[PDB]
Amino acid sequence: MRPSKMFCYQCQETAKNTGCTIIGVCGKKDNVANLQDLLVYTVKGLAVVRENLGYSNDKTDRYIVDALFTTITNVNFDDKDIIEKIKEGLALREEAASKSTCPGCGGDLPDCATWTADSDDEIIKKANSLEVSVLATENEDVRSLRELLTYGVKGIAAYLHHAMVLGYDNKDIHKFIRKALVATTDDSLSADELTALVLECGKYAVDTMALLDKANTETYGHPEITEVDIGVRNNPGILISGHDLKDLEQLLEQTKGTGVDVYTHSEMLPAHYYPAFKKYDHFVGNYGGSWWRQKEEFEAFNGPIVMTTNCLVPPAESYKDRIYTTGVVGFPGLKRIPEDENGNKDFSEVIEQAKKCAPPKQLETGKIVGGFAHNQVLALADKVVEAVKSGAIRKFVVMAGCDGRHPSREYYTEFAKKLPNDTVILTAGCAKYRYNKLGLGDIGGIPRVLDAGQCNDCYSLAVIALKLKEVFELDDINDLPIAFNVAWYEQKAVAVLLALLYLGVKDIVLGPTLPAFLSPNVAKVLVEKFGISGITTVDEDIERLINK
Ligand code: SF4
Ligand SMILES: [Mg+2]
């Protein structure tokens, strides 16, 4: 018997930092949360069956990453979509089971690999069962490690999805996803074995971020130094949000010559840094701030909005008629832009709607500079190294990650403003919006905020650090003049954290709170072995991270 209507604690904003049990803080309703649990459960069973067969296939690999992405915070609020995804997994699982060479193994299989439902009512009943809840794992340390691994796997799945959209893949990462999912169903594993899998999850997060970096840069060019306008023009626009650059490619192609401008929002900002998008005259600039302001900013934008990934907030009535979903995003009543047989998407109706809209309300004017991904920073290596050797740059501070609504996040704005003028902030992901419009200036022409791109472009920050480690002949990445004060919100940030731990980064400050899914004993290991700490006050953290 489920002790509460739902249980979800996978993001930074979980209620009281102990768990959403009646309705999600994000707006995810109990029935949706329980259906998402059943979707994860169904994916775990599908992984068990594929591991029994000994191999997977492309349609199953894509399904598994897409189904996991469907359950990431702020992606899909639509119970109908989640039910359809559950049924798709059951059909793929039954297909796989029909190809089994050892079907006598059925009775030894965990329930997630064999459960069935003969009706939508039986699906809902199963979704409401205790066995599909996150709380089904009874020991709190085993639960903590399984959930941490699972959320790291969701983050891998999101980034892998984007690589696959662009025609890139790595079947070893999919093999790891299945292995990890199976492990969370395996009561024979010890906590040490789960701990090893969490570390291996960081290794595969590096590999996945490397693959997505290859996909984005081979397709659209290497990011380069770019000034991005944050004001508006006088034409109707379409605002594109989330992370998917292929969606933008098609939107820009289809709006060329139409009189409809295109603007980016939140994690679409880094598209401006890629040469393939810079080429379009009607690609205007970046509108507003990070995802949590979107109810106000999407209304002010006046034109249609295309949400390619998270973060989607349950929309205000004022713009519900002009916000569209795509990819795995969903919300009841929002129309979707589906892929055709080739993965092409048709924005014609969004464009015809945009022609009838007022132009965007100006929220601000000016320009921000960005595009300091790994190729661009490597081209500046002599200048960066010279600034380090002279002490013009005494310390880099990685403040990358993912913003959110909690006002405690003011810490990051105040921290950025109080840093001394001989430090440089390295950023990526929407955490940047706490400090990327502050006018912090430059050090000998190197901006004091260096934006490498989306949260996945934390990969570039790791590559830059590893290059500086090589240049300075250090044998420990932590011997660089670098500090980490990272903000997190959902599961892609968890995968980024694990990647950093796997790469050997110690003493990360993680905030503005520590995840609810760390049990006391698990958090103890992160503190004592990896040096993780939470934020305190700006002055104390400036002192410990910068001046000592
Ligand atoms: S995704 Fe976050 S806010 Fe939403 S229900 Fe889960 S823990 Fe709560
Ligand atoms: Mg519905």
CA atoms within 13 A on the CB side of 440: 26
Experimental technique, in short, is X-ray
How many other CB atoms are found less than 10 A from the CB of residue 465?
Answer: 21
Closest CA to 290 of 393, 481, 140, 429: 429
Sign of CA dihedral 352, 353, 359, 361: negative
DSSP state of 392: S
What is the rounded CA–CA span in Å between residue 544 and residue 287? 35
Q: Record the tokens describing residue 441, joined without a space.
A: 């200036």
How far is Cα 59 from Cα 63, in angstroms, rounded to an integer? 6
Rounded to the nearest angstrom, the distance between the alpha carbon of 78 and the centre of ligand 2 is 6
| Contact between residue 502 and residue 196 where contact means Cβ atoms under 8 Å apart | no
**Contact criterion met (CB below 8 Å) for 271 and 217:** no
Distance CA 174, CA 50 (A): 11
Q: In what order do the strands lie in the sheet with 305-307?
A: 283-286, 261-264, 237-241, 305-307, 323-326, 336-337
* CA dist list (Å): 195 to 148, 150, 517: 10, 12, 14
| For ligand 1, atom 2: residue with the closest CA | 11
Residue 292 makes CB contacts below 8 A (sequence gap 6+) with 311, 313, 403, 404, 405
Specify whether the CB–CB gap between 365 and 393 falls below 8 A.
Answer: no
Residue 57 CB partners (closer than 8 Å, separation 6+)? none
Cβ contact 27:331 at 8 Å:
no
Nearest to 267 by CA among 519, 5, 489: 489
Ligand 1 pocket (Cβ < 6 Å) reads 8-11, 13-14, 20, 24-26, 28, 33, 73
Atom of ligand 1 nearest to the CA of 8: 6
CA 414 to chain centre: 25
Give the mutation target among 5, 8, 68, 71 for probing the ligand 1 site: most ligand atoms within 8 A of CB: 8
Distance CA 319, CA 306 (A): 12
Overall resolution, Å: 1.4
* Contact present, 54 and 10 (Cβ < 8 Å): no
CA of 189 to the centre of ligand 2 (A): 38
- Asked whether the beta carbons of 220 and 171 are under 8 A apart, the reply is no
**Rounded to the nearest whole angstrom, what is the distance from the C-alpha of residue 79 to the centroid of ligand 2?**
5
CA of 19 relative to ligand 1 center, distance in Å: 8
Mutate to test the pocket of ligand 1, among 6, 7, 12, 13 (most ligand atoms within 8 A of CB): 13
Ligand of minimum distance to the alpha carbon of 80: 2
Using only C-alpha atoms, what is the Rg of the chain? Answer: 23
Ligand nearest to the CA of 82: 2
Instruction: Give counts: helices (H), strands (E), the chain.
Output: 19, 15
Round to whole Å and give the CA distance between 270 and 27: 28
Distances (CA, A) of 494 to 10, 154, 198, 226, 487: 10, 9, 11, 29, 10
Three-state DSSP class for residue 170: coil
Task: Check: CB of residue 451 under 8 Å from CB of residue 432.
Answer: yes
**DSSP H/E element including 431:** none
- Rounded CA-CA distance 250/246 in Å is 6
How long, in residues, is the chain? 548
Q: How many whole angstroms separate alpha carbon 511 and alpha carbon 541?
A: 12
From the CA of 77, how far away is ligand 2's center (Å)? Answer: 9
146 CB-side CA count, 13 A: 24
Distance CA 71, CA 76 (A): 7
Q: Cα 3 to the chain's mean position, in Å?
A: 30
Which two tokens mark 89? 């997994």
Distance 531 CA to ligand 2 centre (A): 44
Q: Are strands 261-264 and 367-370 parallel, antiparallel or unpaired?
A: unpaired
Token pair recorded at residue 461: 């920050």
Q: What's the one-letter identity of residue 50?
A: R
Q: Are 499 and 478 in contact (CB under 8 A)?
A: no
| CB crowding 105-123: b at 16 or more within 10 Å, else e | eeeeebebbebebeeeeeb
Distance between first and last Cα of the chain: 52
Give the residue, out of 21, 23, 28, with the most ligand 1 atoms within 8 A of its beta carbon, to mutate for a pocket test. 28
What tokens appear for 54 in the block? 């000994």
Ligand 1: atom nearest CA of 19 is: 7
Q: Which two tokens stand for residue 243?
A: 């992370």
Q: What are phi and psi of 184, to 5 degrees?
A: -70, -10
| Distance separating alpha carbons of residues 425 and 253, to the nearest angstrom | 34
Burial of 492 (0-12, 13-18, 19+ CB in 10 A): buried
Q: Which amino acid is at 282?
A: H
The partner residues of 511 in beta bridges, in order of sequence, read 487
Residue 220: CA atoms inside 13 Å, Cβ hemisphere, count?
27
Distance between Cα 332 and ligand 2 center (Å):
6
Per DSSP, 330 falls in state B
